[PDB]
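Target chain:
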Amino acid sequence: AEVVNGKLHLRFAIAPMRPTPSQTIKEFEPIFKYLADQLGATYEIVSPESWAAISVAMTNGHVDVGWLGPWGYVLSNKKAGTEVLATVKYRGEPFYKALIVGRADLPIKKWPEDAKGLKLSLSDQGNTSGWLIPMAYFKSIGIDPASYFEYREGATFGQNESQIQHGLIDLGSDMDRGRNGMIEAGQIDPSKSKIVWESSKLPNNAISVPKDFDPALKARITEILTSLSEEKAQSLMGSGYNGFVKAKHSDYKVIEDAGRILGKLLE
């Protein structure tokens, strides 16, 4: 937070919501422009190439207000004391759930023991809902997925869902917003799969600021974002994103617990 031409000037950053920084900034700059306008501030906006990159940018002091992912926030909080102000709503909900999905014909009476030795497909390690959360779940009950299952990492959620539906793999990670989107789009037949495990609620994101960011501004940013009507918030953001709720660190407990058990919060 600095002064330029006699005015507050803010550095904003948006996670990679869309396949390119250009497309992300096109669709999400409006909520940031709105925020800066409501403060009478000028601004800069960047969109790093990865969810990890925006966490690093915030940690390394390059960002006044960041749209971080939940794990990016928790890590940045641990490393630099980054504070969360709010969480974005998608179709009115500020949270999602990580899933493990299975072929509909899998005989699973006891989870996960009945699935021992089956194929499991998790995502690339940088994906919170596809890897961090389910891997932390297995570790939390004494399971090493690489030894317990016929295990693969690196699949996309679309690969997992299509391969499950076609009977080629057994279990795969997904997240509920994504699975629903694929059903709505007619891209998968949900009768051929079932949810065998769901996480607790995970916050969609974290609107974040540095440690010791001016308390007056924190409050004002929170008020400006949480005051938005569904229609006004949606007019300023990509499809589905339609409000903000006030947030606090404890909302991220499931995320923090997962990073904790995988040794990702050790100094």
User: Anything to note?
Assistant: The two ends are 28 Å apart (CA to CA).
